Amino acid sequence: MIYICGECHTENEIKSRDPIRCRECGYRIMYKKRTKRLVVFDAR
């Protein structure tokens, strides 16, 4: 999975086994990327 660093915005891949850390800043907050499933709204 791809995560976005919370301080330097770097998309980096992370497995389900390793501790999370930005691989060019060392930052310890990561955000999941937006889903690729189609999302549809009525404009009401």
Q: Is 28 left (phi over 0), alpha (psi -120 to 50) or beta?
A: alpha
Distance CA 36, CA 41 (A): 15
* CB of 17 or CB of 32, closer to other proteins: 32
Distance CA 32, CA 20 (A): 12
List the x/- string, 18-37, binding to Zn ion by CB under 5 A: ----x--x-x----------
* CB of 24 or CB of 39, closer to other proteins: 39
Residues of the shown chain interacting with other proteins in the complex, contacts defined by CB under 8 A: 4, 6, 9, 31, 34, 38-44
